[PDB]
RNA sequence: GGUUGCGGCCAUAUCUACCAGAAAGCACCGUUUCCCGUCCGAUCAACUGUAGUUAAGCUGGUAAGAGCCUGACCGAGUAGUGUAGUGGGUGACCAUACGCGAAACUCAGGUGCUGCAAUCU
RNA sequence: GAGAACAGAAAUCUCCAGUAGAACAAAAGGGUAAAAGCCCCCUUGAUUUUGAUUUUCAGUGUGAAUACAAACCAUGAAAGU
RNA sequence: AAGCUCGUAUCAGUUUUAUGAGGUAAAGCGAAUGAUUAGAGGUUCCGGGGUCGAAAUGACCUUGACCUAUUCUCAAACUUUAAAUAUGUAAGAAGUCCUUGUUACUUAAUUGAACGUGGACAUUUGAAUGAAGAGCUUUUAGUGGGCCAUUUUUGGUAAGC
């Protein structure tokens, strides 16, 4: 029925798709460091694309992954910025959901003009207890059909705490 | 076919496709039989004994007109081709008695020009949705 | 060609006895276009052995003209008369190998009265000579003997 | 999920071996532990299988046969109450004890137990059990870690240490025992001994005791109940070795009910399936149900 | 020009069996081989070392050597009008005990035994195989099996 | 009979969906002093067996279920083929004689078996 | 496939399905899924001696290759390689 | 050509029995790859052109693309299946069984591995058929343009090519 299997954040992934290498990317990364309190990880370009100005294996973007109580606090901050309203897109078929903010100063965070202003993606993935089953080395398995996150279930979860609005369809 | 019985009184099917490529060597002094492998010249269908070339479906009314299409048609092909009329309902299969027993039973669903046959094999659920007529009170 | 030789048939109209089993039956199959064969009667065997029985004795081919000759080579297996020989042939039986081998290949003439068909090299079933003509081998061999 | 598998996909699909499907056996490793030199004929390669469940430590000396693997002897941390240990039954110290037990146990049954003492001393210094002269070579065994990660300080090499100190020849190296310094490229045997007798659990017990009566009380509910004070962990383990060396022989559980009695209940909670006829009836029924459009 | 590399012509020969690609099961590594054993060679193209050249695919020889990872095999190969003796170093993945030497040894035992019970009864034996024999007379009955008579059938088109 | 560890063969064992599971086991599951590894104790390491749960895993059942397996005078003695003729036929090609013999098709049945060691109302 | 500010067909971030439909310098074929592919850690077995063996064959040479013996090393907890 | 060593033997352009290997013929294509005719249904909530309020970030369109279940037809360099003919090995005295000797190899181990002593078992001693004797050595001639027929088969319109 419902005892164990509650439903929760697996992780929060803050992503700043910077777009270039050098000072600006090192500057953005500092935003994620000074926010996640972790040290962030940098992504390289999969391939060259002239009209975006990036070369393959050039570091274009930074992200950082957060878990447990701290990720839940940063999530809240974001929601605040969008005045507790997301859209019925936003939520994946497989139970996760996300949103983005422009200017990160909109959630705590002073200004330090040597840092500047960055917008950012927010992706939060939902699971239940027992995900370990699909993540562990020995006897890796798949989570049962009942169990396992869905757009319906997690939209309703999210409305129900957060006291929030989904929107549109 | 069309002028005697109408743009519409039959369905003619060319049952043979010209997949085999013919070559010409092709001589333009002259080179010789040196390196004589040909270039592609044309296509052909490799046809067998008793292998069907054309098929036509019409209404029983049109038998004679139909045969004359296929009789007029022979004069365009090398070899000996016979015109056989078949026990078999149209292009399906099943001799008309066995096709009929079926259609008067609900086992046959019209698809795109051809047709779909009720099986006793898949899921009970969706064979019932596929062939409602087959299991229904009905008359 | 090999089979013909292993069966001691290396000359036209020469003939021998074969014990039928699977290991020999597949030999007769391989050879069928080149031979005529069948089921010999006592009569036929009696007369083949009386008229044209010769034995093998230090290679040499020796006419069986006294029972002493048979006993001297086949005595060791029972078989001390020409009729002892015929019996080990017709009943097959335990020394058939050795008895039969002692008998040289029979040298028949062409059939007196003919082959009875316009063409020998088709099967007996197809109008004649070659293959197993069964009982009808006696009539053919009798005219060849 | 509309990610449906075409009947063609399934039809050409080649399944992994069963134990591969079920995530238990690494076959690349198995080929290399098991396969014997061809000119040593039927000389068994013997593995020291060590596994951990969430509550038990399994220790097995196993060898191979086309018709299946064959165990020479086995020992389980669950046995350890017999010899004085009643808690931390999957901790490093138990891994060590279990490796000791299996060692003394098999080479008891091998005759080899008196010749090849082991260490007896124990300061956890790096040493293999080396062969007597003019006598039997020691019984040799190769660690099978299964799917466990080779981390420097892993429980699994605790079982290796107990079993090596037990007198088995189990080839190995220091660099995964706790106490190996990657900068130093040395092994501080002080640290390793500490683990053998549970030092890391013991020090924690004290720190927690002094800094959190409450959390100390849950994590060590047991020790509290048994009046086991912390700085007597070493005795427990030290005395446990004594016991184990004193008497490695296997005594099997005392066993209420017989294999038969077990059978007649123990999965006559087993669903029994239908005969091709009952199935038909179900078929014919389901239609009569389903027939008639909607 | 022409091309005759070492693995020339081997596309279907060294291929793995349908739905049988991948790891080779351990049985293969657990067979024991002795000098004088009779093995059949058959390449496993997933193991490129210790591999028989393709002439030896499908051929059976005798083990003449045993090594860490391979057996040496003696094959008699015909070159010209004469067999030459060839020795091969095949890894074990490519070799398999000849199953007919097994029936044979089994029968040799069976034979020794048949001989034993025969002597310890003091009777004749008969130990060699006879081929399939002609077939003895029978009487077939007609009780429930009155012969059904058949005739040839008229031509007919089914198209 | 269940369950676990190590297996043999490697779908009758896989796939999809829905049920059900006593006891023990197994599991999920609590913790972060310690050895150890992470962007992240999620995985990996360690610690308790203590606070909890059969939800999942896992085991078994259901299904005119997809697949896989097996059988059959199901198709078919068909297709193809070794051998024979101064056989037919302008030829394409075909028939007969002595033999060997498929695949698809159809229908029926089936859906892991098992070795070692341990443990269990 | 379903999801996430600027973000677009195409940038980065989750999750699901996924028998190989990818990758493995190169032609093609074979082979491979806790790998033979991808990321990382340590390395010089691409070394030393001299025989046997497989292909091509005359059972000469050459190229290539296989399994041992005797050294000295690499790696790994180890079996091993 | 010269012989030599022996003498029923192990032989063999053959069968049988047993046990292997093979991917051609055929077959297949609502099975993988590749090709190919036709509709049918459903998708696009993420390619597009309209008409409906220019309206459209909204409907019903026809048109692609794609998906599902069907449908007609194919492969020397495609295939799950898979022949016939050809093809490897075996059918014992150099064998079998019992006892227990040697070693520096090998094993936890007189444990294995090899090779042996001593003891036992010869009527069919281990299928068939044949054997015109089997085995072996040296030396040397000519030849090193080939062509034809059935069947398989490649190039070519074909050819007494």
UniProtKB/Swiss-Prot annotation, chain A:
One of its GO terms (molecular function) is RNA binding. Coiled coil: none annotated. The modification N6,N6,N6-trimethyllysine is found at residue 70. It is found in: Cytoplasm; Nucleus. Gene3D superfamilies: 3.30.1440.10. PROSITE patterns: RIBOSOMAL_L5. It comes from the Eukaryota. Disulfide bonds: none annotated. Pfam families: Ribosomal_L5, Ribosomal_L5_C. Transmembrane segments: none annotated. Present with 39000 molecules/cell in log phase SD medium. There are 2 genes for uL5 in yeast. This is Large ribosomal subunit protein uL5A. It comes from Saccharomyces cerevisiae (strain ATCC 204508 / S288c).
UniProtKB/Swiss-Prot annotation, chain B:
The keyword rRNA-binding does not apply. Belongs to the universal ribosomal protein uL16 family. Changing residue 112 to D: In QSR1-1; synthetic lethal. It is found in: Cytoplasm. Component of the ribosome, a large ribonucleoprotein complex responsible for the synthesis of proteins in the cell. The small ribosomal subunit (SSU) binds messenger RNAs (mRNAs) and translates the encoded message by selecting cognate aminoacyl-transfer RNA (tRNA) molecules. The large subunit (LSU) contains the ribosomal catalytic site termed the peptidyl transferase center (PTC), which catalyzes the formation of peptide bonds, thereby polymerizing the amino acids delivered by tRNAs into a polypeptide chain. Keywords: Cytoplasm, Isopeptide bond, Phosphoprotein, Repeat, Ribonucleoprotein, Ribosomal protein, Ubl conjugation. GO terms for molecular function: structural constituent of ribosome. The chain holds residues 76 to 221 of 221 of the full protein. This is Large ribosomal subunit protein uL16. Residues 85-134 are annotated as: 2 X 15-17 AA approximate repeats. The modification Phosphoserine is found at residues 61, 123. One of its GO terms (cellular component) is cytosol. One of its GO terms (biological process) is translation. The keyword Phosphoprotein applies. Component of the large ribosomal subunit (LSU). Mature yeast ribosomes consist of a small (40S) and a large (60S) subunit. The 40S small subunit contains 1 molecule of ribosomal RNA (18S rRNA) and 33 different proteins (encoded by 57 genes). The large 60S subunit contains 3 rRNA molecules (25S, 5.8S and 5S rRNA) and 46 different proteins (encoded by 81 genes). Sequence repeats lie at residues 85-99, 118-134. There is a cross-link at residue 26 (Glycyl lysine isopeptide (Lys-Gly) (interchain with G-Cter in ubiquitin)).
From Swiss-Prot, chain C:
GO terms for cellular component: cytoplasm; cytosol; cytosolic large ribosomal subunit. Its main location: cytoplasm. Disulfide bonds: none annotated. GO terms for molecular function: RNA binding; structural constituent of ribosome. This is Large ribosomal subunit protein uL30A. Present with 101000 molecules/cell in log phase SD medium. Component of the large ribosomal subunit (LSU). Mature yeast ribosomes consist of a small (40S) and a large (60S) subunit. The 40S small subunit contains 1 molecule of ribosomal RNA (18S rRNA) and 33 different proteins (encoded by 57 genes). The large 60S subunit contains 3 rRNA molecules (25S, 5.8S and 5S rRNA) and 46 different proteins (encoded by 81 genes). Belongs to the universal ribosomal protein uL30 family. Component of the ribosome, a large ribonucleoprotein complex responsible for the synthesis of proteins in the cell. The small ribosomal subunit (SSU) binds messenger RNAs (mRNAs) and translates the encoded message by selecting cognate aminoacyl-transfer RNA (tRNA) molecules. The large subunit (LSU) contains the ribosomal catalytic site termed the peptidyl transferase center (PTC), which catalyzes the formation of peptide bonds, thereby polymerizing the amino acids delivered by tRNAs into a polypeptide chain. The keyword Cytoplasm applies. Transmembrane segments: none annotated. It comes from Saccharomyces cerevisiae (strain ATCC 204508 / S288c). It comes from the Eukaryota. It is found in: Cytoplasm. The keyword Nucleotide-binding does not apply.
Swiss-Prot record, chain D:
Disulfide bonds: none annotated. InterPro entries: Rbsml_uL18_euk (IPR005485), Ribosomal_uL18_C_euk (IPR025607). GO terms for biological process: cytoplasmic translation; ribosomal large subunit assembly. Coiled coil: none annotated. One of its GO terms (molecular function) is 5S rRNA binding. Component of the ribosome, a large ribonucleoprotein complex responsible for the synthesis of proteins in the cell. The small ribosomal subunit (SSU) binds messenger RNAs (mRNAs) and translates the encoded message by selecting cognate aminoacyl-transfer RNA (tRNA) molecules. The large subunit (LSU) contains the ribosomal catalytic site termed the peptidyl transferase center (PTC), which catalyzes the formation of peptide bonds, thereby polymerizing the amino acids delivered by tRNAs into a polypeptide chain. Component of the large ribosomal subunit (LSU). Mature yeast ribosomes consist of a small (40S) and a large (60S) subunit. The 40S small subunit contains 1 molecule of ribosomal RNA (18S rRNA) and 33 different proteins (encoded by 57 genes). The large 60S subunit contains 3 rRNA molecules (25S, 5.8S and 5S rRNA) and 46 different proteins (encoded by 81 genes). Component of a hexameric 5S RNP precursor complex, composed of 5S RNA, RRS1, RPF2, RPL5, RPL11A/RPL11B and SYO1; this complex acts as a precursor for ribosome assembly. This is Large ribosomal subunit protein uL18. The gene is RPL5.
């Amino acid at each position: 029925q419902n005892p164990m299997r509650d439903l929760k954040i697996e992780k929060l992934v803050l992503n700043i798709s910077v777009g270039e290498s050098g000072d600006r990317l090192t500057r953005a990364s500092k935003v994620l460091e000074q926010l996640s309190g972790q040290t962030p990880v940098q992504s390289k370009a999969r391939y060259t694309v002239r009209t975006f100005g990036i070369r393959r294996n050039e570091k274009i973007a930074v992200h950082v992954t957060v878990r447990g109580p701290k990720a839940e606090e940063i999530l809240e901050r974001g929601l605040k910025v969008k005045e507790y309203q997301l859209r019925d897109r936003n939520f994946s078929a497989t139970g996760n959901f996300g949103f983005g903010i422009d200017e990160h100063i909109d959630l705590g965070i002073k200004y330090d003009p040597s840092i500047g202003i960055f917008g950012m993606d927010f992706y939060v993935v939902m699971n239940r207890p027992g995900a370990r089953v699909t993540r562990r080395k020995r006897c890796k398995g798949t989570v049962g059909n009942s169990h396992k996150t869905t757009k319906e279930d997690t939209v309703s979860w999210f409305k129900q705490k957060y006291d929030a609005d989904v929107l549109d369809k | 076919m069309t002028t005697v019985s109408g743009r519409d009184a039959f369905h003619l099917r060319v049952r043979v496709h010209p997949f085999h490529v013919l070559r010409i060597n092709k001589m333009l002094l002259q080179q010789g039989m040196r390196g004589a492998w040909g270039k592609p010249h044309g296509l052909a269908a490799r046809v067998d004994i008793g292998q069907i070339i054309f098929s036509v479906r019409t209404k029983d009314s049109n038998k004679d007109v139909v045969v004359e299409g296929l009789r007029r048609a022979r004069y365009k092909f090398p070899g000996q081709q016979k015109i056989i009329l078949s026990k078999k309902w149209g292009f399906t299969n099943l001799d008309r008695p066995e096709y009929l027993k079926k259609r008067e039973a609900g086992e046959v669903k019209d698809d795109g020009a051809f047709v779909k046959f009720l099986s006793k094999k898949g899921s009970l659920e969706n064979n019932i949705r596929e062939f409602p007529e087959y299991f229904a009170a009905q008359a | 060609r090999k089979v013909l030789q292993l069966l001691r048939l290396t000359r036209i109209n020469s003939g021998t006895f074969v014990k039928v089993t699977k290991a020999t039956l597949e030999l007769l199959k391989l050879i069928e276009p080149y031979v005529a064969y069948g089921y010999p009667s006592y009569s036929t065997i009696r007369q083949l052995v009386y008229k044209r029985g010769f034995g093998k004795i230090n290679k040499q081919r020796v006419p069986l003209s006294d029972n002493a000759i048979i006993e001297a080579n086949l005595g060791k297996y029972g078989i001390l008369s020409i009729d002892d020989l015929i019996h080990e042939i017709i009943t097959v039986g335990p020394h058939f190998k050795q008895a039969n081998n002692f008998l040289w290949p029979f040298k028949l003439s062409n059939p007196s009265g003919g082959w009875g068909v316009p063409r020998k090299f088709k099967h007996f079933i197809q109008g004649g000579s070659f293959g197993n003509r069964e009982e009808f081998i006696n009539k053919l061999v009798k005219s060849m003997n | 999920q509309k990610d449906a598998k075409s009947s063609a996909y399934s039809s050409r699909f080649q399944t992994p071996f069963r134990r591969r499907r079920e995530g238990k056996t690494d076959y690349y490793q198995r080929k290399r532990l098991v396969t014997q030199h061809k000119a040593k004929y039927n000389t068994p390669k013997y593995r020291l299988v060590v596994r951990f469940t969430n509550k038990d430590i399994i220790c097995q000396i196993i060898s191979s046969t086309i018709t299946g693997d064959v165990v020479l002897a086995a020992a389980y941390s669950h046995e350890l109450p017999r010899y004085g240990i009643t808690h931390g039954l999957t901790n490093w110290a138990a891994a060590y004890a279990t490796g000791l037990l299996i060692a003394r146990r098999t080479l008891q049954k091998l005759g080899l137990d008196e010749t090849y003492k082991g260490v007896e001393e124990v300061e956890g210094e790096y040493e293999l059990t080396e062969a007597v002269e003019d006598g039997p070579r020691p019984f040799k065994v190769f660690l099978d870690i299964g799917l466990q990660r080779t981390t420097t300080g892993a429980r699994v090499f605790g079982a290796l240490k107990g079993a090596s100190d037990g007198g088995l020849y189990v080839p190995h190296s220091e660099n995964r025992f706790p106490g190996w310094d990657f900068e130093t490229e040395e092994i501080d045997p002080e640290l390793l001994r500490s683990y053998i007798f549970g030092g890391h659990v013991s020090q924690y017990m004290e720190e927690l005791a002094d800094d959190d009566e409450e959390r100390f009380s849950e994590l060590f509910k047991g020790y509290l109940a048994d009046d086991i004070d912390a700085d007597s962990l070493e005795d427990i383990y030290t005395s446990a070795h004594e016991a184990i060396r004193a008497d490695p022989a296997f005594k099997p559980t005392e066993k209420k009910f017989t294999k038969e009695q077990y059978a007649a209940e123990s999965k006559k909670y087993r669903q029994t399936k239908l005969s091709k006829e009952e199935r038909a009836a179900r078929v014919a029924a389901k239609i009569a149900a389903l027939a008639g459009q909607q | 020009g022409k091309s005759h590399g070492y693995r020339s012509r081997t596309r279907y020969m060294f291929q793995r069996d349908f739905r049988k690609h991948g790891a080779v099961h351990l049985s293969t590594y657990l067979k024991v081989y002795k000098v004088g054993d009779i093995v059949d060679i058959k390449a496993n193209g997933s193991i490129q070392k210790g591999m028989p050249h393709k002439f030896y695919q499908g051929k059976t020889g005798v083990v003449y050597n045993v090594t860490k990872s391979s057996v040496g095999v003696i094959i008699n190969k015909m070159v010209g009008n004469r067999y030459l003796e060839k020795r091969l170093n095949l890894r074990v993945e490519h070799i398999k005990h000849s199953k007919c030497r097994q029936e044979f040894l089994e029968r040799v035992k069976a034979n020794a035994a048949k001989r034993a019970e025969a002597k310890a009864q003091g009777v004749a034996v008969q130990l060699k195989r006879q081929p399939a024999q002609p077939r003895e007379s029978r009487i077939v009955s007609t009780e429930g099996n009155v012969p059904q008579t058949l005739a040839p059938v008229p031509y007919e088109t089914f198209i």
